[PDB]
Ligand binder design. Sequence first.
Ligand SMILES: Nc1ncnc2c1ncn2[C@@H]1O[C@H](COP(=O)(O)OP(=O)(O)OP(O)(O)=S)[C@@H](O)[C@H]1O
Ligand SMILES: Nc1ncnc2c1ncn2[C@@H]1O[C@H](COP(=O)(O)OP(=O)(O)OP(O)(O)=S)[C@@H](O)[C@H]1O
Ligand SMILES: [Mg+2]
Ligand SMILES: [Mg+2]
Lengths: 190, 71, 401, 92, 429, 87
Amino acid sequence: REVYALLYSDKKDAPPLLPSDTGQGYRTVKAKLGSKKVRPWKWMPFTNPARKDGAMFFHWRRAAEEGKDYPFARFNKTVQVPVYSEQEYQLYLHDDAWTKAETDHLFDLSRRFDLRFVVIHDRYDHQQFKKRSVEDLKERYYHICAKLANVRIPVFDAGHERRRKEQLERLYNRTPEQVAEEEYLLQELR
Amino acid sequence: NQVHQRIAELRKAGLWSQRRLPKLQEAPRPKSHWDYLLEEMQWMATDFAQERRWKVAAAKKLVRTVVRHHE
Amino acid sequence: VYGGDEVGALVFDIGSYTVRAGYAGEDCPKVDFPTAIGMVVEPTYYIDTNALRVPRENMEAISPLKNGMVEDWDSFQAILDHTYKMHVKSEASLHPVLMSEAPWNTRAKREKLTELMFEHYNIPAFFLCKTAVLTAFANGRSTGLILDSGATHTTAIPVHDGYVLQQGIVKSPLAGDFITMQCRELFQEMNIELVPPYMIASKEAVREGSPANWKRKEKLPQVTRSWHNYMCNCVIQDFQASVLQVSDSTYDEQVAAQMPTVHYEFPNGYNCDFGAERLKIPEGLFDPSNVKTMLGVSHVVTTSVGMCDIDIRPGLYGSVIVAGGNTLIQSFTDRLNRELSQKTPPSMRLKLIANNTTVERRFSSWIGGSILASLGTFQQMWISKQEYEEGGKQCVERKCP
Amino acid sequence: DGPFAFRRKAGCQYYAPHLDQTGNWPWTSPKDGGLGDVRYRYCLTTLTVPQRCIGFARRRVGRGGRVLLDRAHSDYDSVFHHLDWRHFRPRT
Amino acid sequence: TQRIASHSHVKGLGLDESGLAKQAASGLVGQENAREACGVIVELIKSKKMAGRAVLLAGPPGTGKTALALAIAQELGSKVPFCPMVGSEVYSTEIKKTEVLMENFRRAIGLRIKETKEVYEGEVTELTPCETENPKTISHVIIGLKTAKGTKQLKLDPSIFESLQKERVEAGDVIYIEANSGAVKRQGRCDTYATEFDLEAEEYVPLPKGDVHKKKEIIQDVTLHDLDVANARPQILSMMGQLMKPKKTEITDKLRGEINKVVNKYIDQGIAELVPGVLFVDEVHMLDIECFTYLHRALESSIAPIVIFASNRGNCVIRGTEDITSPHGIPLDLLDRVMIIRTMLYTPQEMKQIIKIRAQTEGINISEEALNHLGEIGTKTTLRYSVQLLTPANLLAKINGKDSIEKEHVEEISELFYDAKSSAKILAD
Amino acid sequence: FWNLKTLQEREARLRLEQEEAELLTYTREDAYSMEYVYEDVDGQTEVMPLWTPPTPPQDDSDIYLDSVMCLMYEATPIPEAKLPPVY
Ligand SMILES: Nc1ncnc2c1ncn2[C@@H]1O[C@H](COP(=O)(O)OP(=O)(O)OP(O)(O)=S)[C@@H](O)[C@H]1O
Ligand SMILES: Nc1ncnc2c1ncn2[C@@H]1O[C@H](COP(=O)(O)OP(=O)(O)OP(O)(O)=S)[C@@H](O)[C@H]1O
Ligand SMILES: [Mg+2]
Ligand SMILES: [Mg+2]
């Protein structure tokens, strides 16, 4: 038996226990605190090498840590997305169903939103270019990536994903009588 | 029986949820900067909620102790 | 790598009701003054509560925001200057600023806001995030259906992976202002003369239903109709907070009549028992068809999710976040949860995040802004002034998604 | 099956749907359909000072590097106080 | 435990659920009928119904009579008191022989005492009296006690004020207060106030762990002989008694009856439970006629333990008689009171099995041909002799850098050491 | 009666003192110096998990997982043994 929660489990939860000295009294820990002295902290500018501009923000950091490389810069790495020349498109990637500027818009969005195709679909310029389903965006992206890799791996199956979503939509839209029916079948077929 | 035909007709229509299609695996990718940002965000939000709960409870404790000191 | 880095950034969340501001890393906005400001045509601006509540000749009450977006940039600059000088007490060029924005904010308005922040206030860094994402971030959720009901709109905003799915935004005009108008109509039907507290020199205790025995303040200057309407709106909103209650189910006259009455005292000493009409008024938020084609809040919810990818609908129903002041009406959360559980598909888990307090409902966007601004991983996201030198038009739309 | 039949293609892998139990977020119990990712779990914990079980707790790092014990309410908290399942205790 | 004795391999009677003896199990080989009779004796002991029942293990030397008695001891467990004696022990210089016999009888009756104590222990945090008007008058004395678990306040009877000052209790003292008597006992300053600079030893104790209020169960195992000795001579008369030699005394039947009464009262009160056990008398033919006659009366007591005799003497004159020969050195009158279990000689195969089990218990690697040679040595000579050859042959092998005994090592050790019969042969020549 | 009243008033005061929060802080030794372990009936040991801020990636082993996908499908690819053959 155990409990799971994110932020907290219930409104009646007891407060967290914070660490602190002197909880057993200051007098007993007097000699330890008096034996030492704190290291100096500074309000200092820091370079973030993940940023390309070079802007300097400020930190509370120890004096010896001044000028050290920003640790959060290690997180910075983007989702690998291929880049193609105008020539490579003209040679290989041409499709009568897709404009080049439309594909370039798709790939720019992909680089922006880390291949989160639901977000790409939301941000896709359906007004200027043709309306696209998320399966169409995935199809075009994975087709281009596979073709570029072959020119210079689980392949995408657009039909299977389309069928999967259509089935999920059909299962979602059904009336409460049509889910009462299914649960009554599921319980009576046992 | 008739229930079997009903199930078969639902399955033909796709509406039989017991036989839902699987999901084709996306090509694998490592975590991006935004994924680490959302992880750190979730951790910081937890720390905020717990710190607020601690400050409220500690204030209540100290004030009721002062009231007992006067009583 | 370590805990999030605090870079001394400011978090501004300027809504139509109150301007919420403070320092990043705090768990509550250190200031929230009404968005409505006083204007005298010369213009002289009276901005905060201490100044608004005193009568002045030829002073109008206006708001910089219109439909969740800023329209009058002069009043916006006035509010920003007042916030800085009085509450922030620090130079604008010294602290990075993270501001919230409406889910539906236009590109030109975002560019104008960024231009104002960089050219006028000379801030070192800037970021503009959506209110819905910050509300989700305040709850530690990267995805979910934000349901915001302030004074201007009741809006469902689907967030996925920290991004607002703008196609799924559904907005309704039923909000706190609609409730204020409904209470105004109720008072008019009962022939209660709304006397704002500023006109009362003295009052005497009277019984329920008795005529008010109050003395009018003398030497009162002439006031504009806008300021009088604003003061009446203030008293009506006090009434809304104190009296109104959402029925635990679909409103019924008999059940409403059975339940006990609640007593309220108006500023002029007039007091009454408000019976069952206190339940009828909030019912318009849920069943607008009975108010003398708007969608109910539960229908705004269920419509908004239906416009998203069905891969993400399980997550949207699995994380419903309620925010906004108008959601603090008694039993509003319970009624909403009941209706959504009744309407939600059985195959998907529905869970309303349990945070129901004034701080967690009204300031949620500011809390999310503070959380985001305190992240070390977020320090890459800032728009710098050097970046504004080149991409003043180009990058501002691209840097803040 | 017909219009919604499963057709495998070469060089492809698939994720089976959830049928027995509806899924849930990682921060939720496997009894509640969740992944149960252990960073979210609260388990019974004993302190050294006081030498008493504080009940269900989880170790979480705070903002300043401060390690914090989050605590979850339970109806049997008094019994856990009298106590001397997965029950963690500190050791050098 | 760790050192290996002549019976260290006997782990019990190798009996099945049906009471039949396995051919070789639990360290015993053969003696199937004798082992089955010993198992019935074990059931008799565990029944606890009977008193003074006697059994005689009888048979040639080295037929496992002592092994069977120690196997009964293993089967009964460590709870049942099993008192070994040899008949030579009755001839004491401090007390008469029949007193030695009665003392060993009472050593084989166990009693298990159960004490349940309720105690309130903790570090003293307050001693505030509660003043009142009498219908300064105090109606209660409040004591606050702290343990590692928590803190409790007690509303004690005011009369406990005498014991608090008698014990000189102050704040910071660990004390305990028993529920029944209400008397406080002080056990030192809490060690949280000890510095490394001050010198005291007995006056500091660690802060108690656990809840302030505790319920303790104390279980003690004693024999009736322990109670006899305790009540016969309790521990200036003590100074002279401890300076002088505390000899054994001829405890009177009056004391034994009083202790029987007290133990029956405890058993009625539920505080105690009796565990009657076994007295084993090896070499019982060393007893004399006075001892055997006394044993007639001793075994007819309703309080007596179950006694196991062993003899190998055959038709032998009874000690302390003249020319009275008896079938076991044990007069026919006493033999009429005992059930007899016969033990029989071993076959060569049974001897080989015993030799192998001994080599295993001694940790000795023995080759097959060495085992056959040692078995045939044991079919000559004696079993005991052939077993005794194992470890010196292992040592001889270790000297020659062999991890296992080879036949040549057995031969050489046999040439070095001789048995009783070969030595009688040398003496005759 | 006066004593009964005073004891009920005392128990009320003690209840008020106990309803208030008991613990708000724990020692530094427990916080950092000592690791928390659990030993089961077989002697296997488990260390209590620590929810830390995200660790920087050393390689591309930090594979992304869609937490919303895991609400409808399970996180492991179907084994080829139970996968139906190619259509
Ligand atoms: N405790 C309360 N109970 C009931 N209504 C309240 C309460 N507090 C605030 N309100 C109402 O909530 C509305 C303001 O909510 P907010 O979300 O703070 O507005 P805002 O966010 O500043 O501006 P918008 O409309 O969201 S752009 C007003 O109509 C208030 O009357
Ligand atoms: N059946 C048996 N199984 C295993 N070991 C045995 C067996 N019988 C005897 N032994 C062992 O061989 C030795 C001889 O047995 P003992 O019990 O000593 O014989 P005994 O009958 O006591 O001979 P006496 O009469 O005392 S000289 C001891 O070391 C026993 O442990
Ligand atoms: Mg708002
Ligand atoms: Mg013997």
